[PDB]
Amino acid sequence: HHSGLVKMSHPSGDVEACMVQVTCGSMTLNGLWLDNTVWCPRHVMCPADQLSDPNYDALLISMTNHSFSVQKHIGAPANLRVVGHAMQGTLLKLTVDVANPSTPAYTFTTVKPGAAFSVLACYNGRPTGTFTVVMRPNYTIKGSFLCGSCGSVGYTKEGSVINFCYMHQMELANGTHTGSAFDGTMYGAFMDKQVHQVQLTDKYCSVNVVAWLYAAILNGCAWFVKPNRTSVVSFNEWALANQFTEFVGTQSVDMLAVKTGVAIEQLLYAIQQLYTGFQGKQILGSTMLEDEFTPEDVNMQIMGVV
């Protein structure tokens, strides 16, 4: 029996229309063109033989507006003349002479661990694929990014407003990925330097495991539901010792509890038992806990509720 759950991304058209290629000499990557501003990773400034320890302050001073070439390749092509350049954290803010006529309604936001967002993977300013990821508790994402993908963007949507939350910077030693928020800070403790970096321990996202167990109930799979309960407080002390995030309830989870008539605390008890082993059984075709679907995913994809 199929759960009805897929990895669903937002439609990407509105964001495709904002993607550009930024070139600074022998260096190129992707940028995001909104209003009169183009955002891109600041290591587009750095020579290859310096990425291990750049002085980004000195590299920025060395640039002029004419040092940057910004091109839109898809749709109606454009070459954008840079009329101002600034640094904000790990991002460049380039001011251009033309406001993007396709600028959508948008905000900038930071995403929190366990939350899902959509990614538009781009190369040389050309969108090539889209996928969705959950921000991990260690501030990485399990993405799909190759050389030349930096500047690819991640976003959520609230109605027709796009909330840009991520712009891609790097791949870590374990194959996961991280990037900047549009305030210029990097997610987690990472620096945009070509050095090996200390990576932090990941955890199960407990609110997402709960959502996935609700999705199983909504598909008639409820062998793991018992009358026994574990309080949120007691689950959260248990979580600290067992590689789980602490559970924080939300209205989205509450809707799942009302729809199914199964209490959150029943599923917190179930998680504690299932973590010690599924004992030959499966849940939604899996023999281990799934934390990559959010309460919002389950409400929208199965119940049609946004």
Ligand X SMILES: *[C@H](O)[C@H](C[C@@H]1CCNC1=O)NC(=O)[C@H](CC(C)C)NC(=O)OC[C@H]1CCC(=O)N1CC1CCCCC1
For position 197 contacting ligand X by CB under 6 A, the verdict is yes
d(CA 264, CA 55): 50
3-state DSSP assignment of residue 37:
strand
Question: Quick one: which of 14, 192, 202, 292 contacts ligand X (CB under 6 A)?
Answer: 192
Distance (Å, rounded) from C-alpha 20 to C-alpha 79? 9
Instruction: Choose the stretch contacting ligand X; rule: CB under 6 A; options: 129-137, 195-203, 242-250, 253-261.
Output: 195-203
Instruction: Determine which helix (DSSP H) or strand (DSSP E) holds 19, and give its type and residue range.
Output: strand 19-24
- Which of ligand X, a copy of itself, none interacts with 200 (beta carbon under 5 to 8 A by kind)? a copy of itself
129 touches a copy of itself by CB under 8 A: no
58 binding a copy of itself? (CB under 8 A) = no
- Give the active site residue among 43, 85, 168, 177: 43
Phi-psi map region of 130: left, alpha, beta (phi>0 left; psi -120 to 50 alpha): beta
By beta-carbon proximity to ligand X, the closer residue of 76 and 146 is 146
Residue sitting closest to ligand X (CB): 150
The interface region with a copy of itself, picked from 4-12, 180-188, 269-277, 288-296 by CB under 8 A, is 180-188
- 3-state secondary structure at position 78: strand
Q: What DSSP line would sit under 95-156, residue for residue? A: EESS--TTPPSEEE----TT-EEEEEEEETTEEEEEEEEE--TTS-B-----TT-TT-EEEE
Tell me the closest approach of the beta carbon of residue 249 to a copy of itself, in angstroms: 7
Q: Is 43 a catalytic residue?
A: yes
* Range 138-177, binding ligand X (CB under 6 A): 145-150, 169-173, 177
Sites for ligand X among residues 23-62 (CB under 6 A): 29, 43, 51
Say how far apart CA 169 and CA 20 lie, in whole Å. Answer: 16
In 10 A of CB 201, how many CB atoms?
Answer: 7
SS3 category, 251: helix
Residue recorded with tokens 């260096």: 27
Query: Which of 40, 122, 150, 221 is labelled catalytic?
Result: 150
Instruction: Kindly state the helix (H) or strand (E) to which residue 79 belongs, with its residue range.
Output: strand 78-80
3-state secondary structure of 208: helix
Task: Examine the residue annotation and report whether 85 is marked as an active-site residue of this protein.
Answer: no
User: Is 184 among the residues that bind a copy of itself (CB under 8 A)?
Assistant: yes
236 in contact with a copy of itself (CB under 8 A): yes
Using CB under 6 A as the binding rule, whether residue 262 contacts ligand X is answered as no
State how far the Cα of 9 lies from the Cα of 5, in Å rounded to an integer.
12
As a whole number of angstroms, the distance between CA 227 and CA 194 comes to 53
**Rounded to an integer, what distance in angstroms lies between the CA atom of residue 167 and that of residue 183?**
11
Q: Give the one entry of ligand X, a copy of itself, none that residue 112 binds, where binding means its C-beta sits below a cut-off of 5 to 8 angstroms depending on kind.
A: a copy of itself
Select from a copy of itself, ligand X, none the partner in contact with residue 42, using the beta carbon and a kind-dependent cut-off of 5 to 8 Å.
none
Question: Which sequence positions are flagged as catalytic?
Answer: 43, 150
Residues forming contacts to ligand X in the complex (CB under 6 A) are 29, 43, 51, 145-150, 169-173, 177, 192-197
Residues forming contacts to a copy of itself in the complex (CB under 8 A) are 88-89, 107-110, 112, 181, 183-185, 189, 197-198, 200-201, 232-233, 236-237, 240, 243, 246-249
